[PDB]
């Protein structure tokens, strides 16, 4: 329901090896789910600390349309990866990070490979999941609310559960509910 223009100008494509998903570009940092550094066999019992050390900056390919962002640093904050790039996003809006509760509504900008596809109003169920096919294949899409001119990011999609529901974190990397990225 919220207009998505301010958020569209922050969405990017993040690729590591064969994995490609959405990232959020604010200032000179790109936020994305940390399981992007995982391969197929990694996602069963991943050592995220060992994988972080194994990857170099040039293992990360970040694209904002045709502009290519050069990764000059990468750190991990809970379950989100933070990629420092060599350029600040000139379209960075006024923003803050907030943590919400189930039952509260927010708008989700569903993207695929960095391209905005739709915006939808939804809410987490009491078990901290979201039911909706609109998000299938949208790893890294973010949820948000607009407080006048400020964009409050409150959600990042991380994974689809076997039961067709979706799990995610806040922008500090803390999962909503008891879920784990393994």
Author numbering: 7 to 188
Paper text:
In Severe Acute Respiratory Syndrome CoronaVirus 2 (SARS-CoV-2) and its closely related SARS-CoV, a single copy of the main protease (MPro, nsp5) encoded within the polyprotein (pp) 1a and 1ab mediates its self-cleavage (autoprocessing) at its termini (nsp4/nsp5 and nsp5/nsp6) and other cleavages between nsp6 and nsp16. The fully active mature MPro is a homodimer, with one active site per monomer, and exhibits a monomer-dimer dissociation constant (Kdimer) in the low micromolar range. The active site consists of a Cys145-His41 catalytic dyad. Domains I (residues 8–101) and II (residues 102–184) exhibit a chymotrypsin-like fold, and domain III (residues 201–306), comprises a cluster of five alpha-helices connected to domain II by a long loop (residues 185–200).
To understand the structural implications of our solution measurements of the enzymatic activity and inhibition of MPro1–199, we obtained its room-temperature structure in the inhibitor-free form at 2.25 Å resolution. MPro1–199 crystallizes with two independent molecules present in the asymmetric unit of P212121 space group that lacks a crystallographic 2-fold axis. The two independent molecules of MPro1–199 do not form a native dimer. We modeled residues 7–188 in both independent molecules in MPro1–199, whereas the rest of the N-terminal and C-terminal residues are highly dynamic and are not visible in the electron density map. Indeed, an unwinding of the oxyanion loop is evident, starting from Gly143 that shifts by >4 Å away from the catalytic Cys145, opening the substrate binding subsite S1 wider. This conformational shift squeezes the stretch of residues 139–142 into a short 310 helix, which pulls a whole loop consisting of residues 130–138 closer to the newly formed helix by 1.2–1.6 Å. The organization of substrate binding subsite S1 is preserved in MPro1–199 relative to its structure in MProWT even though the N-terminus of the second protomer that usually caps S1 as part of the mature homodimer is no longer present in the truncated enzyme. In the absence of the stabilizing effect of the N-terminus, the side chain of Glu166 rotates from its position observed in MProWT, where it hydrogen bonds the N-terminus of the second protomer toward the oxyanion loop. In the new conformation in MPro1–199, Glu166 makes a 3.0 Å hydrogen bond with the main chain amide NH of Gly143 that was part of the oxyanion hole in MProWT. The structural studies presented above indicate that the catalytic domain encompassing the region 1–199 of MPro adopts a native-like fold for residues 7–188 with an unwound oxyanion loop conformation (E), which defines the catalytically inactive state of monomeric MPro.
